[PDB]
Amino acid sequence: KETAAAKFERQHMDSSTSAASSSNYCNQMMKSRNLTKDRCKPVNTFVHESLADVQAVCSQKNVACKNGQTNCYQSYSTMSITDCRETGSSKYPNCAYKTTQANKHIIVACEGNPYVPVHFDASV
């Protein structure tokens, strides 16, 4: 049902805060964005920038995706991001996440018309 664009927005956009608040940011967000529903999503990154700024990345530096596809774009500037990764104590259905806040260039795969992000590849 969910569009590729809307899935990206749900998993990766958090324009409501400038940066991760607290060590419990990832537990709260991973749950609230429905990323812990049937299993604990092991790794997920949230971007703390406007949706317009993340979308604009699709007309920035064209770079290879890790899988060798050619529709990835690297942000010209660094962006506030939070990486959420499961800890060793994480056991579904009590998922647990480490929160790491950082300022990194993001790399996204773009598709469609409008040409928008559909996958978070990596950050640098």
Q: Does 93 bind Cl ion (CB under 5 A)?
A: yes
- Spatial distance between the Cα atoms of 99 and 26, rounded to a whole number of angstroms: 5
**Min dist. Cβ of residue 71 to Cs ion (A):** 6
Q: Does 90 bind Cs ion (CB under 5 A)?
A: no
**Peptide bond preceding 114 in cis form (omega within 30 of 0):** yes
Q: Which helix (H) or strand (E) holds 5?
A: helix 4-12
Q: Does 55 bind Cl ion (CB under 5 A)?
A: no
- Spatial distance between the Cα atoms of 70 and 49, rounded to a whole number of angstroms: 24
CB 82 within 8 A of CB 7: no
The single residue among 27, 36, 74, 75 that binds Cl ion, judged by CB under 5 A, is 36
The number of C-alpha atoms within 13 Å of 68 and in the hemisphere containing its C-beta is 0
**Min dist. Cβ of residue 43 to Cl ion (A):** 6
Q: Does 23 bind Cs ion (CB under 5 A)?
A: yes
Q: Does 90 bind Cl ion (CB under 5 A)?
A: yes
Q: Does 100 bind Cl ion (CB under 5 A)?
A: no
Among 2, 4, 12, CA closest to 118 = 4
Binding range to Cs ion, per CB under 5 A, among 39-47, 79-87, 88-96, 103-111 = 79-87
Catalytic residues: 12, 119
Residue ranges in contact with Cs ion by CB under 5 A: 18, 23, 32, 48, 62, 80
**Known binding positions for substrate:** 7, 10, 41-45, 66, 85
